Each structure stands twice: as C-alpha cells, then as structure tokens.
Amino acid sequence: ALKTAVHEKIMNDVVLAVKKNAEWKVLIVDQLSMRMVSACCKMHEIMSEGITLVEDINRRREPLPLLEAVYLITPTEESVKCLMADFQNPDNPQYRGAHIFFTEACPEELFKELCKSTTARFIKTLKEINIAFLPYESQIFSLDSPDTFQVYYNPSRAQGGIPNKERCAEQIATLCATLGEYPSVRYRSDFDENASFAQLVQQKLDAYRADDPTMGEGPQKDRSQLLILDRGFDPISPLLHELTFQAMAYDLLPIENDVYKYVEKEVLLDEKDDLWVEMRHQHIAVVSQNVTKKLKQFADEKRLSQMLKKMPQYQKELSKYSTHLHLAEDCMKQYQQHVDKLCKVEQDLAMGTDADGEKIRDHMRNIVPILLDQKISAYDKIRIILLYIIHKGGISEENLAKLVQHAHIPAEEKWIINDMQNLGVPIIQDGGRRKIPQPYHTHNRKERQADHTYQMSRWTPYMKDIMEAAVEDKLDTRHYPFLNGGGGPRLIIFVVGGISYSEMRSAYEVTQTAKNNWEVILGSTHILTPEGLLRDLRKISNP
Amino acid sequence: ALKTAVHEKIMNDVVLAVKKNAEWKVLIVDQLSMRMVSACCKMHEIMSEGITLVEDINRRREPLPLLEAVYLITPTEESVKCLMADFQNPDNPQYRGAHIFFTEACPEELFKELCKSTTARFIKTLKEINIAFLPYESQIFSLDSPDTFQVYYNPSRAQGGIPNKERCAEQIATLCATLGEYPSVRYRSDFDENASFAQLVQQKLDAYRADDPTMGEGPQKDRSQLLILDRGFDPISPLLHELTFQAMAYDLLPIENDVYKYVEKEVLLDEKDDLWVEMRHQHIAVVSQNVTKKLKQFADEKRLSQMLKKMPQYQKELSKYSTHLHLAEDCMKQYQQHVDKLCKVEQDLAMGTDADGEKIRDHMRNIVPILLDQKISAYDKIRIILLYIIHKGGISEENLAKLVQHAHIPAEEKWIINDMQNLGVPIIQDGGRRKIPQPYHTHNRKERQADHTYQMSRWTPYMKDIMEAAVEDKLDTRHYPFLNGGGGPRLIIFVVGGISYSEMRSAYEVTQTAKNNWEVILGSTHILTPEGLLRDLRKISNP
C-alpha cells in the first residue's frame, strides 16, 4: 500500500530518528502535513515515542522552553514564517531547540531567508522527507493542485505554467520514490500537452534515481509503468450519477473536506474508519443491508474495573454503525427525491443502449422533459446536456442554444458546456476543424454483456478498460506509447485534471482481481466530483 | 397491573369518548399529565384514534382554528390559566372548541374563575378522570407530596396539618378506586400518627365505595389489604448505597426529574423505554454485560422506499443501547471513585455481621478512618454516622459530638443526625425516656443464609420481609393490626415519608415470585433518595 510507504518514513525517518534519551518533544505540523500524518499513523504510535504533544504550526499554542520541537511542515511561506516566529527572538524562544523536517526540498529563496533568521541558531536538524503528495487512500493519492486544471485547459494560462507543471512532475516523482519505483512512462498521445508533461515527469524521476539507485529494485519492480492521462480521455465517467456508497455520498451530500456532518455531530470519512473502508465501494442497494449484517456480526463478538475500559470503545463501535446508516439514509433519500429520474436519462445516454439494448429517441427527447423539470437543478441539467452532446459527438451552435433555453441555465453557467471542448471533447458540431475521436464511447470499447445486475448502474469507466489492459500487458501503443522504450508490478496511472470516485473504485477492483500480482495506483491533481468538475470548467471562462 | 387501569381510563374515557365522526383533534397535556399518558399508552394507539397532534398546554404551539381540542390537564393555576389564554379572546381563538378532561376534581376557586372566562363558551365537555396520584411505575405510585414528611415529622407543624394529611388520604383513596379495590386497612402501631392517619384513609375510601359499589368486586378483591407504614419502620434501607442499576444511578448521578443528561444529549428514564424497564433492577456487576447481550439479540432481528422507514426507528434502538451503557458507565466510574469504600463500612453496619458473619470492632473504628477520608463527602459521612448510631441503638450526646467533629460536618448539617429521632429511631442514647424498638435490625428478622452472591450487597429491606408475610397471609397484628376487622389479591403498601428504589425493587421481586397470584403495589408521599432523605430531615430544624 502507498499508505504503508508514507507511514514508514514518518516513523523511521522522523519520530524515531529524533526519539532519543528518555526525554520529550512536541510535534509541530501544518494543514497539509497533519493531513498525511493523520492518514498513515495513529497518535498512539506517535505519542508513545516521546511525542508529548502535537499541534498546528499556525494556530498559536503555549510555549515549552525546555522541550525540543520537531517541525514536520511544508516549505511554504506561511509555515516557514510561523517557524521563524517561534524563535523570532532568542532570550524568549519557545522550545529549547528545533528539528526541522520539510515535506519536500525547500525553495532556495525561502531556505536562504531562513538561514538569515534568528531561528538558524536553534536548528539542530534539517532534512526533508520527500512527500509532495497526499495519500488520500490506500491506492489513491492527490497532488492537491486543482489549479493545474486551469494551467492545462485554460488557453490564456499556457505561458507561465511550466513552473506549475513541473511541480506536479516533482510531486509525482516523490510518489514513485516513496514507492521505491522507477517505472516506464507512457501517455495518451491523442492530447498533446501529455507528451510534453510526460517529459518533466521523467526528468524529475531520473533525478530521483540518481540520488538513490534503490529506486526500482530488482524483483518485479521494472515491469512497473506510469501512465499519464488527460481529463479528456473520458468526459463521461466524471459526469455520471454513481450509485456506490462513497461515489454517491459525495455527489448528493454536502461533504466539505471529507467531513460528513448530519442531524450537530460530525464525522470524518477516513481510512481509519474500518466500516467506511468496507462500505465505500458498495451499491446503495445493499449498503444499509450489509451495514446491519455487520452490526450483528459485531455483537456476537462481545460474549468490573477492567470492564469500565471495554466500554469507551464499545461506544465508538455503535457510533460508526449509526453514522453509516445515517449516511446511507441521507443517500437513499436524495435518490428518490430526484436522482433515480436523472439516472435513467444519463445511463441511456452513456450506454447508447438502455436496459434492453435498443437505441433511443435521441435528438431532443427524454432530455427536454427533464430539462423542464422544475425540481431538477441547473447543474443537473448541464450534466444531462453535456452527456447528451457527447453522445451526439457534437451539436450545432443553434440546437445547443436551444437546449440551454429550455433549461433556463443562467448565463454564468452557459459557457461551462462550451469549454468542455478545451479538454478535447467535441461539443460544437462543425467548428470547421479536424475531426475528434471518442475512445470512451461504448461502441469503441471491448464488449461487455448487457447483464448488469442494476439498471441504473450500466456504465463502466473507460479507465477500467485501460487498466485491465495494461495489467494483462496488452495496452495499445499508438495511443498510449512509452516515453521511448520499455515494457510490484505496479501500475501507476495519473490523470491531469482530476479523477472520480468511480475511477478510484475501479482501481481497487482491477487491483483485487485477475491481478497478475499487479497493483493499480490511481492518482491525480485533485479528487473530482460531478459538480466539482463543472465548477472546474467554469473557471476557464470566468476565473 | 395499575398500568392497565390507567391505560383504560385514558382511552375509554378520553380518547375514544371524544373520537367522533371522521374528524380530527389535538391532544393538549401538561407536565404531569403527559407523564402518565406516556406511561400507559403509546402515541400509536392515540394518534390513530383521531389525534393528529399532541402537545404541552404551556409550551406555546401553532393554532388550529378548525380543530376541536382535547385538554387532558391537571387543575393547577398554570394549566387552567394557559387554557384560559388559548381562548382569552374569541374572534381569534385557536381550536374551534374545547373538551376539558381534568386529572382530578377542580378547585371550586379555580373552577369558578374558569366559568367567568371568555373560555367558558368554547367548552363543549367538562369532566375529570379522578387520578389524584402519579402512576410512577407499573407497581409504584407517588402522591408527589414531599411536604407531608414535615407535616408528619416536624413537631411545630402538627396543628394545621389535618388539611394536608387528609388530602393524602383523598389521593390514596383514588388509587384504590382507580384499581377497583376496597382493601382492608392495616398500619404499623409502633408509631401513633399511623392509626390516626389510617382513619382518614378509611373514611376517604368509604366515601368512594358509596359513589360506586363496584369498588371491591367479588373475585379475589376482598383479600386485598392496604398497609400504612411510617418512614421510621426502617431508617436503614433508605440510607444504604444500593448497587442495582436504577437504585445506584439515582444516588450517584445528578438525575433531575427522572431525566439523565450526559456527555449535550439528554434522555428520560421512563416506562416507555423498554430497555430501562428490563435493566433498572439489575446489579451493576452484570448491567453492561446483559445490556450488550441484548444489543446482539436485537441485531439478529433485522435479518428501498419501504426501508427508508425501517430506519428512523432502527436509529432509536441504537441510541437506547448507547445511553444505557453510557449510563451504566457513569455508574461504574463513581463506584471506584469512592463508593466501594463506603459500601464496605455500611454493609457491615447494616448487616451487623460482615461478609463472614463475624461481628466487628464497633464503637469508633472503621468509621473514623472514613470520617477523615478527605475525598468522601459531608453527606456520605452523615449517612455512615446515622447507620452507625442506628447500629449502636443510640449514642451519647458526647460521642455523637465527637464523630461530628472528626467529620468536619458543617453546623448546618449537624442536626440532620439528631432529627432522625423524630421518626422513632433512637439516636441520643439516654434522653431519659421510654425504650424504643428496632424491628428492622437483622437479628430481629427471620434468618436468611449468609450466602449473598455479592459482598457489597448483603442487606435486605425489612419492607420485603413485611410483604412476603402479608402475601403468605402471616403478618403479625400486634404490630400491624387491621383498622378494625378483616383478613387481585392486591397488597397496597403506603409509606408516609418517602420510599427507596431498593424498596420499589422489592415490591417487584415479591410480586413476581411465590405470589399466590398476589401483586404488591408500593406507593408513597414521594420517591426518596439517600441524600434526598437527608435533605428531608434537614427541613425539620431548618425549613
């Protein structure tokens, strides 16, 4: 797991490497850093390694003059300045000394400014653990750089983007490093910025191979490939209304920064929550169902001072079981409120052949009735239109202008449809240009029987197709060439422009199947969400 | 059950008697009324009888001009005024008309004030269901008159008490009525006010027999007895630190008006809570234990629109299971914090023979060490001292003065010990008076093997002894005579001065055992609590 890799560094290269002589220190982390720490290890392991306290470099906290401090922060202005402040004045510093562990090489501009600080004296250590990415999940990582979307798709952003682009490379490089992998680069050639990008990625990791010959060590590690994909390789998947717990939850519910508040108790959906890790990839159809089947299975495993301890945790269990039903409930509600409705139109559009493989009255049918539905929202309608246009392979400046009217889609959201083009997708019918392909459409992909256990869930992400090929070592190269030559093992896929939970799900499935011992790791600039993707297209024409 | 009796009236004399012509009405209840309603019937039965809504006469609620309203309230100023306000102005009343069902005959002073109100017009009905008591539990009722304690034990309250005393009679009379019982009166003769009181009780229920010959109808109802006891019949039980869930909970936790708030969600411990009804009478030793054994047993009994309903209640279940553990936890904590400690001294004192039937170093031993314990509280110490004095059968003005000092018991609480005497209990050794008995002491009661499964729980309330006799029809009469002659069936015990949960528990046990089909119903002026009893003795010398 990528999870394990990070967990390793944090303990073996930070907490333990500093733990010395029955003493005590404070652990200072920031926004991002705390994120990954809290994703790979539990305080327990940390606190019980000489870490009396843990807290945010920013949020001001109480001084501890006689204690060494371990700073595990990112080379950002904010953090570095907050650091410099903690020792902005000797003869009154807080924390006896300072052990600095940067998340990634520090800017020579900032680094140099730190060396000319009153803080330079207290610095007893100075390293960086090379972790420019967030271990979002066991098999998923995020560069947390949603702006790259712009850099990549906003025309008036091209020049003055290299900085941003290569930082992603840099970031991606540390993912490979942290995994002890020196993979073969491949990229979808149907979009040009890809090859260009593919380069920086190589260069960045060539450099990493230098500072460590262990990167890509014997065994299977060599059959490993790093495939770079652009968002345009599949505009459908990211738009659909998925009905698997995790996928669905984040689309219909208001879950800010992975935290689900409900009717006020709030809970964080995280790797740490075992239940969540075992439910996120399941159909609402059976969620509530299996959730309770789990509750019991749990009870059967519980059959005066030593007991007054078995309690605090027995309470925790019950709570998980409540929030998940409670979570799966909010879902089931929203579905009936209007979603099932859209799921029919959408599936038919993405499948090209509804439930019984017919065709459809495509051109202005099923659509309009929905587009008028006064209950359905603006974005819901935009999603249905895009999927619609995508199916037609394009549409006239005219017709499009029509659909947009029957939907009463505001002016401010009008362009979102249009810009989808910047990703490669053919939206405006003629435009008098060079024809554009669509590898993601059902008809151009290997057939899969039309026996889907659920009708509202008929679609499969092209992404999965791609994985299943790469894994069985049969992914075409006129479309997904190797940077030059080549061809765990580990399959590293990177989508510049965001990825969907359905795609994240897929990685898991492929990884937990005919896996020739293969493991698929999906990562991206950011984690996408239907409306998220929409807001993202929006920023190109209205930043 | 007394439960059934009340349930009957509420439906057959209120909800049904008003349910007419496919229409709808609102049910308006108050603090007390809602209590008993929620103890005898579930909304289901009510809501599905033309009761669209139920709510508190006080808490202001929305108007429903075209709906009749059914008021089931008590003849109190608060309620009657709130009523009079609902129609304080015609041409803008809320609720088309009004059906008033008083809990008990309304004061001619208040009643008369209601007749001269703008509300008099809207009154389409006016009755009272004759319930001058609180059906606390399935087998316990309370007159909710804690002041009677004073009337009975405060010397300077005797004259000018008859009013209060006979209202209790009146109240007790309606308990017998509501139960269709015309029982034989008996009273502990060792305390004089008893016979005196016994009288009013007879008279009050003679009167009730008049207005209804059905009171005491054939079958077993005639073997039924109403035994009147004074608090002094057992000063021990009420002082002990009981370790059965309910008993314990109310003593160590801060549970105002039967509502347990914890760490803020709050919950009401009530007959309606099935779990509570099945746990209140159990030893902490096994509470948490059986509680979880129940959780599972529940899960095994749960194995998309019709399901989005099975949810709202499945959530309720989980919550019960949490609050009870959570409740039983707060208990287990307190126990270790200091209680176990006291439980040893106390038990030894009340038993006269600790765990292994020895004797003890009684006179100033075990006591003092505790009396100094800076952790233990003032009341805890007072409890230990009383139990101590009670064991000695009394103590010198001197010694008592000593104990009180080693304990640093404030002046304000000093007398509580002394006044315990007003109840008959011999506290000041000599006093130069007529010797006083103690029927409750272990040695004067039938033997019971010293094989108590728990050491901290060795004591049995004399009260139980009394029941087990009356039931097997063998209760002595030189001490518990019949008002004159005589001798369900139903055993009605009434303690003037409060009753303990341990005693409440006992009634159940006796009722659910060798019961010759007998049922024991325990009732009192109020429900006692160790510190409660203390505060009660306090008011005699410092009202």
Q: What is the CATH number of the domain that holds B54?
A: 3.40.50.2060
Least Cα distance to B272 among B508, B64, B34 occurs for B34
Look at B318 and A315 and tell me if their CB atoms are within 8 Å.
Answer: no
Domain that holds residue B101: 1-128
Characterise A243 by phi-psi region: left (phi > 0), alpha (psi -120 to 50), beta (else).
alpha
- Tell me the two tokens of residue A443: 């008809």
Whether A4 and A124 map to the same domain: the answer is yes
Whether B466 and B510 map to the same domain: the answer is yes
Orientation of helix B287-299 relative to helix A287-299, angle to 10°:
140
Whether A323 and A373 map to the same domain: the answer is no
Whether B46 and B119 map to the same domain: the answer is yes
Query: What CATH number corresponds to the domain at position B349?
Result: 1.25.40.60
The set of residues, in sequence order, having a beta carbon less than 8 Å from that of B349 and lying 6+ positions away, is: B384, B387, B388, B390, B391
Q: Is B388 on the interface with A (CB under 8 A)?
A: no
Distance CA A66, CA A25 (A): 9
Distance CA A239, CA A232 (A): 12
Contact B295, B321 (CB under 8 A): yes
Distance CA A412, CA A419 (A): 13
Least Cα distance to B138 among B32, B47, B43, B6 occurs for B6
The residue assigned the tokens 């959201």 is A413
- Tell me the two tokens of residue B82: 């709130």
The SS3 assignment for B109 reads: helix
Contact B417, B386 (CB under 8 A): yes
Least Cα distance to B452 among B442, B444, B438 occurs for B442
Contact B147, B164 (CB under 8 A): yes
Distance CA A37, CA A43 (A): 9
- Structural domains of chain B, count: 4
Whether A140 and A122 map to the same domain: the answer is no
Distance CA B79, CA B106 (A): 11
Distance CA A38, CA A31 (A): 11
The set of residues, in sequence order, having a beta carbon less than 8 Å from that of A196 and lying 6+ positions away, is: none
CA B330 to chain centre: 23
Look at B308 and A332 and tell me if their CB atoms are within 8 Å.
Answer: yes
The DSSP symbol for A337 reads I
The SS3 assignment for A245 reads: helix
The residue assigned the tokens 């409750």 is B440
Of A422, A442, A460, which closes a domain? A460
The SS3 assignment for A356 reads: helix
Least Cα distance to B503 among B193, B244, B255, B181 occurs for B244
Distance CA A195, CA A325 (A): 46
Strand partners, A71: A28, A100
Q: Which residues of chain B are within 8 Å of residue A312 when distances are taken between CB atoms? A: 329
For residue B332, which phi and psi values (nearest 5 degrees)? -50, -35
- Residues across chain A: 543
Contact A418, A534 (CB under 8 A): no
From the CA atom positions of chain B, what is the Rg in Å? 25
The residue assigned the tokens 């998220």 is A532
Query: What CATH number corresponds to the domain at position A314?
Result: 3.90.830.10
Whether A487 and A515 map to the same domain: the answer is yes
Query: From the candidates B329, B334, B340, which should be mutated to test the interface with A, based on the most A CB atoms within 10 A?
Result: B329
Distance CA A181, CA A390 (A): 37
For residue B160, which phi and psi values (nearest 5 degrees)? 95, 35
For residue B395, which phi and psi values (nearest 5 degrees)? -155, 155
Whether B153 and B251 map to the same domain: the answer is no
Whether A89 and A161 map to the same domain: the answer is no
Please, is A536 exposed, middle or buried when counting C-beta atoms within 10 Å of its C-beta (0-12, 13-18, 19+)?
A: buried
Least Cα distance to B318 among A316, A253, A260, A297 occurs for A316
Distance CA A226, CA B431 (A): 99
Resolution in angstrom units: 3.2
Strand partners, A102: A73, A128
Whether B2 and B104 map to the same domain: the answer is yes
Please, is A59 exposed, middle or buried when counting C-beta atoms within 10 Å of its C-beta (0-12, 13-18, 19+)?
A: exposed
The set of residues, in sequence order, having a beta carbon less than 8 Å from that of B33 and lying 6+ positions away, is: B72, B73, B74, B103
Whether A326 and A367 map to the same domain: the answer is no
Amino acid letter, B525: T
Amino acid letter, B480: Y
Of B303, B335, B367, which closes a domain? B335
Nearest to B322 among A318, A325, A326 (CB): A318
Strand partners, A186: A227, A482
Distance CA B186, CA B477 (A): 9
Distance CA B152, CA B147 (A): 9
Query: What CATH number corresponds to the domain at position B516?
Result: 3.40.50.1910
Q: Residue B359: CA atoms inside 13 Å, Cβ hemisphere, count?
A: 4
DSSP A63-127: --TTSEEEEEE-S-HHHHHHHHHHTSSSSS-SSSSEEEEESS---HHHHHHHHTSGGGGGEEEEE
Distance CA B100, CA B74 (A): 10
Distance CA B275, CA A380 (A): 46
Q: Is B265 on the interface with A (CB under 8 A)?
A: no
Strand partners, B102: B73, B128
Orientation of helix A530-541 relative to helix A411-419, angle to 10°:
100
Nearest to A325 among B299, B304, B314 (CB): B314
Orientation of helix B162-178 relative to helix B2-10, angle to 10°:
90
The DSSP symbol for B303 reads -
The DSSP symbol for B441 reads S
Question: Alpha-carbon dihedral of residues B524, B526, B530, B535, nearest 10 degrees?
Answer: -130
- Tell me the two tokens of residue A470: 């790469």
Strand partners, B44: none
Size of interface A-B (CB pairs under 8 A): 76
The SS3 assignment for B479 reads: coil
Amino acid letter, A273: D
Question: Alpha-carbon dihedral of residues B366, B372, B374, B375, nearest 10 degrees?
Answer: 20
Whether A403 and A515 map to the same domain: the answer is no
Q: Which residues of chain A are within 8 Å of residue B338 when distances are taken between CB atoms? A: none
> Alpha-carbon torsion B173, B174, B177, B179, what sign?
negative
Distance CA A368, CA A399 (A): 12
- Tell me the two tokens of residue A324: 């998940």
From the CA atom positions of chain A, what is the Rg in Å? 25
Q: Is A284 on the interface with B (CB under 8 A)?
A: yes
The SS3 assignment for B79 reads: helix
Look at A332 and B284 and tell me if their CB atoms are within 8 Å.
Answer: no
Contact A70, A14 (CB under 8 A): yes
Amino acid letter, B421: Q
Contact A181, A494 (CB under 8 A): no
Distance CA B142, CA B525 (A): 6
Distance CA B140, CA B501 (A): 10
The DSSP symbol for A186 reads E
Distance CA B386, CA B382 (A): 6
Contact B534, B383 (CB under 8 A): yes
- Tell me the two tokens of residue A237: 């998947």
Contact A176, A160 (CB under 8 A): no
H/E stretch holding A206 reads helix A193-210
Look at B292 and A284 and tell me if their CB atoms are within 8 Å.
Answer: no
Least Cα distance to A65 among A29, A26, A93 occurs for A93
Name the method of structure determination: X-ray
Nearest-5° Cα angle at A136, A132 to A142: 45
Distance CA B148, CA B528 (A): 13
The set of residues, in sequence order, having a beta carbon less than 8 Å from that of B225 and lying 6+ positions away, is: B183, B184, B185, B186, B470, B482, B486, B487, B491, B492
- The alpha helices in A393-529, defined as continuous H runs, are 397-406, 411-419, 462-471, 501-511
Contact B185, B202 (CB under 8 A): yes
Distance CA B309, CA B76 (A): 40
Contact B236, B350 (CB under 8 A): yes
DSSP B187-212: E-TTSTHHHHHHHHHHHHHHHHHHT-
- Tell me the two tokens of residue A369: 């009735």
Distance CA A30, CA A37 (A): 10
Of B408, B438, B460, which closes a domain? B460
Whether B224 and B111 map to the same domain: the answer is no
Least Cα distance to B236 among B139, B348, B151, B153 occurs for B348
**Distance (Å) from the alpha carbon of B37 to chain A's nearest alpha carbon:** 28
Q: Which residues of chain B are within 8 Å of residue A329 when distances are taken between CB atoms? A: 308, 311
